Amino acid sequence: SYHRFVEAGRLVYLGDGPDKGKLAVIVDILSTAAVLIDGPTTGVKRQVVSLRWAMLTDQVINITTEQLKKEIEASPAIDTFMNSVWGKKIQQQRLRAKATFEDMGKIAKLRRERKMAMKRIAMSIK
Amino acid sequence: MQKYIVYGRRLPSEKFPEPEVFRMTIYAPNEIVAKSRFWYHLKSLKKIKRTHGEILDCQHIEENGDFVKNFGVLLRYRSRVGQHNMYREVRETTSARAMDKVYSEMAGQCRARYHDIQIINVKEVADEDVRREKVAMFTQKGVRFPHPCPYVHVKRAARTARFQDRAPHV
Amino acid sequence: VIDCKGHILGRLSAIVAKELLHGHEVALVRCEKAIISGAFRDVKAHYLKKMHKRTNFNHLRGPFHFRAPAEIVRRTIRGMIPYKTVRGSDAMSRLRVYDGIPPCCARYKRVVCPSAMAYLCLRPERRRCEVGRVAHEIGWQHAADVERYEKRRLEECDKWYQDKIQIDKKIAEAAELQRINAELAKYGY
Amino acid sequence: MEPTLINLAREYNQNMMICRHCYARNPLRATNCRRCRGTNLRKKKLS
Amino acid sequence: EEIKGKTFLPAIFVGYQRSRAKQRENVALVKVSGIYTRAETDKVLGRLIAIIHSKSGKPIFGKICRPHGNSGMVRARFYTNLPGQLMGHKVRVFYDNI
Amino acid sequence: PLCSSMTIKVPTDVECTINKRVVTVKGKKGTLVRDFSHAPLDITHANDTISVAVWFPRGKRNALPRTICSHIENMFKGVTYGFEYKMRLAYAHFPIAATVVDNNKAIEIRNFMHQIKTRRIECLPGVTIAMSTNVKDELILRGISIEDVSHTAARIHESLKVPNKDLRKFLDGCYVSSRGLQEQ
RNA sequence: UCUAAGCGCGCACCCCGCCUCGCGCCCCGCCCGGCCGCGCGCCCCAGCCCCGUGCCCCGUCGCCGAGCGGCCCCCGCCCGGG
RNA sequence: CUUCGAUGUCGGCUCUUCCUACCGUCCGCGCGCACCGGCGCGGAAGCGUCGGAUUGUUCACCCGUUCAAGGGAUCGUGAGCU
RNA sequence: CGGAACGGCGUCGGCCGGUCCCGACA
C-alpha cells in the first residue's frame, strides 16, 4: 500500500501449513490470492501458497531452484532479515518450539524469579 | 483434480474383429471417477456403454511445474435453465492443478458440481494470446501489488489466545 | 479487564462468555465504544424493534429492554450463559460491566481481544455503528456525562504518561541471570 | 415574471421526467428512475 | 498435603465429557494452559493432575489420557469422580514427577 | 495489480499537504481542509502530482478515485479564486425583500407570496451572501469551499417554497442562475 | 447524474424530556467500626513509523506498608387524632 | 383432524388490546393540478371515524352532524349482563 | 433472509456479434 508490495524477490514468512516459520522468495505471482514460493536455502520446496499463508518480509532479494540458490548466495538480504527484529524473534521462537514438558517447568520457575526480581528492583528504584 | 489418460474399445465381436482403441484425457480425483467419466463420454459420443465394452489402460499422467503456465480451459455446464459453454482461463503450475482451480471457481460462482461440468478442452494458451483480463494482469512481469489480506494474521490471535496487551498494527 | 473500544458486540461476547463459565471473572470497560456491525439505521431499527417485544398483560412481567450500553453488552453475554441454572447464575454475577473506564477499574492492567476487534474482522466499508450512539437514540440520556469524564481521565493519563516513562526508564537503566537464561538458554522465551 | 426568470424556473421545475410507477422526479437524460428500483418508464409534463 | 512445593502448570476443568443428550461423568475435560493444538497435548499426556476440593481441603489426584479436541483441551479421569461443584475450578498438572 | 488512479497537476498558487487522508489546501484566498477517511485512498504528493490510486477496485471502489481527485481540484480552485453562486429571486405580483442581516453571515427574506412568516437563512461558515450590484434581485454567495457554498444555496431555495399549488404556474422563490469559480 | 464515497433538509410516526411508579444506591445525622484486593499511557489500522510482541506462577511462595479502590457497616412500637 | 362421562351457541351492551390491504388529519410526489376543489401515489396507525327512524337482526337503508376506513382477538367479550 | 409472472445501471462471471492506429462534416 505505502511500503512492501508483493513482487518476485520478496522474502516471505510462511505462517500456515507445515512451512510454519520458514522464509522463501516469491518467484511467479499466480493470482491476487496466490504466489509460487521457492526457498532454496530454507527448506521451502517450490510450491503454490495462498498469500494468506504468506506474511511478507521487508527485505526484497535482488533476483529454477539452482538459479535462485545461486542468487541467494550473492544476495545478503536473507542474513539481514535474521538480524532484523522479526528474525531475531524468529530464532528465539525456534528455541521455544524445541522445548518439552520438563523444559517448560524450568522456564516457568525461572520466569517467576524475574516476575519477583522486576517487582523487588522496581520498588527500590522509585 | 488429477490428470488420467484413459483408453477404451468396444468388446471384440465376430462382425468386426478388433475395434479401434480410443483415447481420452480425463481430469479426476481418483481412477474410479476418471473411468466413470470416460464411460460417460464414450456412451454419449461413441454409442458404447461399459457393460458391452472394455477399458484397456488408465495411465496416471503427472507433470513437474517448475514454472507458471497460463492455461485456458473450455468447459460446458448445466444450470437451472439449460446447458452453456464457458472459456475460463486459469494460471497454475500444472494442468491438473489448473482443473482444480477451474472446478472450485465454477462451483464458487456458477454453482456447478463436478458431474455437470464437462471439460471440452484444456490448453496452454501462451502469454501473448491471453483473452481474460484477470489473467492478463500477470501476463506482464512487473507484478507489484500489496498483499490482499494483511488482516489475515487474525489467525495468529487464536494462538496468542486473543489476550494481547495492545491491538496489533498490520 | 477487556477494554471494548472497537470490539464486535457479538464476538467479544463469545470470548467473555466462555471465560465466565470456565470461571475467570472479567470486567469490561469503554463499553460504549464497542461496535454492532451493520449500517446504523438498520442496527438502530433492530434494537428499536427488540424494544417493542413486551408482555401484553403487564409490561412489568415483560422482557426488560435496557438502554444504557453496559447492560446492552451484558444482556448479550446473558444469552451465551445458562442464566437460569446455578452454574450460570454464578458466572453472570462474575461479570462487572462498566460503561466508560470508571475509577473502580482504571488502575487495572488492560488487555484487548485482537481477534474480535472490528478492525481485524469487518472489511473496510462494511459500515459499523457504536453501541454508544445506538444507546443515545434508543433512550440513553447519560451520553455526554460519560464522554466528559472519559476526556478528563484521558487527560490525567496524558500527564501520567510523562511521569510513567521516567519511573520505568530508571528501572531499565539499572539492569545491574534470568534475563540470560529464561529467554536465552536454549529456551528463547 | 420576466422571461429570463421564467426560464430559470422551468429549469428547476418543469424540465425532468417523472417515472410511471415511482412518480418521483428523475433527471432529463434518464436511464433508470433512482427511487423506482430501476424501471425504464418515464414521462414529464408541460404547463 | 503431599502437594506444597510442586512447581505446577495451571489448568481449568471445563466439564464432563458429554453429548447434547447424555453426560459421561467417568471423564473430565481439562483445559491446560499452554496447550493450543491436539499434537500439543502430547507433552501433557499421562501426567499426574490434582484438584483441591475447596470444602474438603484434600488434593483429589487424577490422570489425563486422551485429547478431547483438535484444540488440545485434554480428557482426564480423577481417582474419584469430580463432584460437579468443582466444574470450572482449577486443577494443577504437576511438573515434579513425584 | 489492477487499480484506479487519476493525477492532479498542482496549480503553483496552492500548497496542499496530505497527511493520512486529511487534505489541507493553502492558497491566496484561504485554507480548505477535507476528510478522506470515508474511502480507501493511496493519496500521494511528490513532484506536483496528487494521485488517488485506489487498489484492487472490486466494483464500487473504482468510483471514489475520480470523486476524491475532483474534490482536491475543487479545493485548489477555491483558494486560487473562489466559488460564487448567483441566485435570482423570481416573483410576480408579490415582491421579495431580502436583507444582508449580519456582517454578510446571514440573509432574511420577506414578502414572498405575502407570507407573514419571514424566513431567515443562516449561511454555512465562510459563505458570505451579498446583494448583487450587477443584475438586481440577485444574491451572490462567495466562499472558498464549493460544497459549503452550494449547501447554503440549497438552503435559500429550500426555505422559499410555494406551500401547495402547481409549482409550474405559481413559480416563485430563488434558483441559482450560475456557479462561478472566479472572482470569489 | 440524488448516491456509489460523502453532505444538507426532513413526517399527527418514532426515541427521550415533562409526568406516575421505582428495586436498589448516594449524602448527612447516631455511631463512626470491622474486612478485602493490588494492576493504567493514548491513538490509529490505505502509514501500519517499525508492526507480526509481551504476560504466560493467584499460591506455584506471593501476602509489609504507602496509595487507590471496594466490601460489609448503622437507625423501635403500642397508643390518641387526622 | 380435536371435542358428543357437554369447550354455553346469535346479536346487542360494557370494556380492553391488535392489524394495515389508511377514509379524514401529518410529510412529501404526480395530474387531463390557474384558484377553490377533486383524483392517483409512497412513508405513516398518532388521533378521529359520531347522534338517531325501522328490523332480534351481523348486514341493509334513510335522516341529520365537525359528513363519518376496513377488519382481528375460541364468529374477543353469558360463574359480566340482556 | 415462505413464494410467483415479472422487473433492476447492485456486483461478479459468461455468450453472440460487430465498430475500433483508416482513430472508436469533422
Distance CA A111, CA C189 (A): 9
Is residue B124 helix, strand or coil?
Answer: coil
| Residue D33 among known ligand-binding residues | yes
Quickly give C136 CA vs H70 C1' distance in Å: 38
CB atoms within 10 A of CB B41: 16
CA distances for B132 relative to B86, B91, B138, D37, E46, angstroms: 12, 11, 11, 32, 58
Quickly give F6 CA vs G45 C1' distance in Å: 25
Paired strand residues for F97: F110
Chain C residue with CA closest to E90: the answer is: C23
Q: How was this structure determined?
A: cryo-EM
Q: What is the DSSP letter of F60?
A: S
Cβ of C23 and E31 within 8 Å? no
Evaluate whether B118 touches B99 at the Cβ level (below 8 Å).
no
CB atoms within 10 A of CB B36: 15
Instruction: Write down which residues 33-92 in E have CB closer than 7 A to strand G.
Output: 33-34, 90, 92
Evaluate whether B88 touches B71 at the Cβ level (below 8 Å).
no
CA-only gyration radius of chain A, Å: 19
Paired strand residues for E32: E11
E-interface mutation test, from C22, C86, C87, C95, most E Cβ less than 10 A away: C22
Evaluate whether C116 touches C45 at the Cβ level (below 8 Å).
no
Which resolution in angstroms does this entry have? Answer: 6.5
Closest Cβ–Cβ partner in A94, A110, A125 for C181: A110
Nearest CA to C46 out of C142, C131, C143 is that of C131
Name the pairing type of β-strands C2-3 and C26-29.
parallel
Chains with 3 or more CB pairs closer than 8 angstroms to C?
A, B, E, F
Evaluate whether E53 touches E86 at the Cβ level (below 8 Å).
yes
Evaluate whether D43 touches D17 at the Cβ level (below 8 Å).
yes
The grid cell for D34 is 433512482
CA distance E74 to chain B (A): 17
Nearest CA to C26 out of C84, C83, C73 is that of C73
> Among the residues of F36-145, which ranges form H helices?
63-80
Residue F147 CB partners (closer than 8 Å, separation 6+): F74
Q: Is the CB of C81 under 7 A from strand G?
A: no
Q: Is F46 on the interface with B (CB under 8 A)?
A: no
Residue E85 CB partners (closer than 8 Å, separation 6+): E54, E55
Which nucleotide is the nearest neighbour of B88, by CA and C1'?
I14
The grid cell for C67 is 438502554
Cβ of D14 and F157 within 8 Å? no
Cβ of C189 and A96 within 8 Å? yes
C-E contacts at Cβ under 8 angstroms: 13
Distance CA E87, CA C89 (A): 14
Displacement of CA C146 from its chain's centroid (Å): 14
Distance CA F1, CA F3 (A): 6
Which residues in F lie closer than 8 A to residue A1 (C-beta atoms)?
A: 42, 55
Evaluate whether C44 touches C155 at the Cβ level (below 8 Å).
no
The grid cell for B37 is 467419466
Is residue A1 helix, strand or coil?
Answer: coil
